[PDB]
Structures are given as C-alpha cells and as structure tokens.
Amino acid sequence: AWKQMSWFYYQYLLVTALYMLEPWERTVFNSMLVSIVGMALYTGYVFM
C-alpha cells in the first residue's frame, strides 16, 4: 500500500522533470499546482 504508493510519487517526479530540481524549487511547483486545482473546485461549485 504505502510502499506501492511511493512508486507513484516516484513516477510523478520523472514525468514533470521535478526529479532534477532543488528541494526549494519543488515546494514552489507543488504549491502552485495545488492552488490551481483548489481554486478550480470553488469556481466549479459556485457555477453549478
């Protein structure tokens, strides 16, 4: 479960080329991607 879930994060790190980035550059991308999705649900709910 957890071990098999870590492999998916590993595969996510290679597709987006986040594997070869500094740790402080990973946080920026992760936050900037979570915020977009989070504000794409508030709008979806208020427009339904």
Binding site: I36, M39, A40, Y42, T43
Partner: protein
C-alpha cells in the same frame, strides 16, 4: 543544428495546442471574472508570449552551430533555414487568426473588446510577412 528543426518534431503541434487549451482553463477558474474578459486575457497573453518567443529573442540557447552566424536573427527568421511557407510557418500564422474569431464571437462583438484584440492580432501578424524578414525598425533590438 537541431534548433531550426524543432517545429518538425513528432507531436509538437498537438503539444502546442494543448498548451493554449491549458492556459484557458487556469484562467476560467478565477472565482470572480466574467467570460468575455477571460477570453480577451487568453488571446492577449498568447499573443504576447508568441511575440516575445518568436520575434524578440535573438540567438540559440546553446553554442551556435556556425561561428555565431545566428546571433542576429530571431527564431522566426532562422526557422527552416529562412525558407518561407513551410508546413510549420503556415500553422503558426493560421493559429492566432483562428483564435481571434473565437474571442470576437464569445465577447458578443463588444465595441471595447475589438480595439484590444485587433491591435494584438496585428502585432503578431505584421512581423510574419516575407518583406519584414531581417528588417529592424529604427534600431529597436538591432544588436
């Protein structure tokens, strides 16, 4: 020189269309923004980005193939060795025109939303002409 031959790579047209499609989804998600101005922002941002990336930056990101013979040409002038009307140079001209009809139509042809898109479309169309290939107005970004 695999820089002038990047717009021939397998799946770059489809990966370029999806980029514009994704730009229109992060803009549509803003909690309080009307649809016409969303469409106007999409077109303006795409045109500004394409103008910067195709008609402003001169040179290669890597060491130049020849002894620096491409250091004074934008990415549009060196595309396909400067040979006009290739397959990609038709696509890159038709795309911002087709994207203009949609933003004219979704704005219900408002009088104030036509003086922004037209001035934007013209700016990314004038430089694509065969006569302006190598010309530099006044001296703006000559060297």
């Amino acid at each position: 020189n695999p820089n002038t031959r990047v717009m021939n790579s397998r799946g770059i047209w489809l990966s370029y269309v999806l980029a514009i499609g994704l730009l229109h989804i992060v803009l549509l998600s803003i909690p309080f923004v009307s649809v016409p101005v969303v469409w106007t922002l999409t077109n303006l941002i795409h045109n500004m980005g394409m103008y910067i990336f195709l008609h402003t930056v001169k040179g290669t990101p890597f060491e130049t193939p020849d002894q620096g013979k491409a250091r004074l040409l934008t990415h549009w002038e060196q595309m396909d060795y400067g040979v006009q009307f290739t397959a990609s140079r038709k696509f890159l001209t038709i795309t911002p025109i087709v994207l203009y009809f949609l933003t004219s139509f979704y704005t219900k042809y408002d009088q104030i939303h036509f003086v922004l898109n037209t001035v934007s479309l013209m700016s990314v169309l004038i430089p694509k002409l065969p006569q302006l290939h190598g010309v530099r107005i006044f001296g703006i970004n000559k060297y």
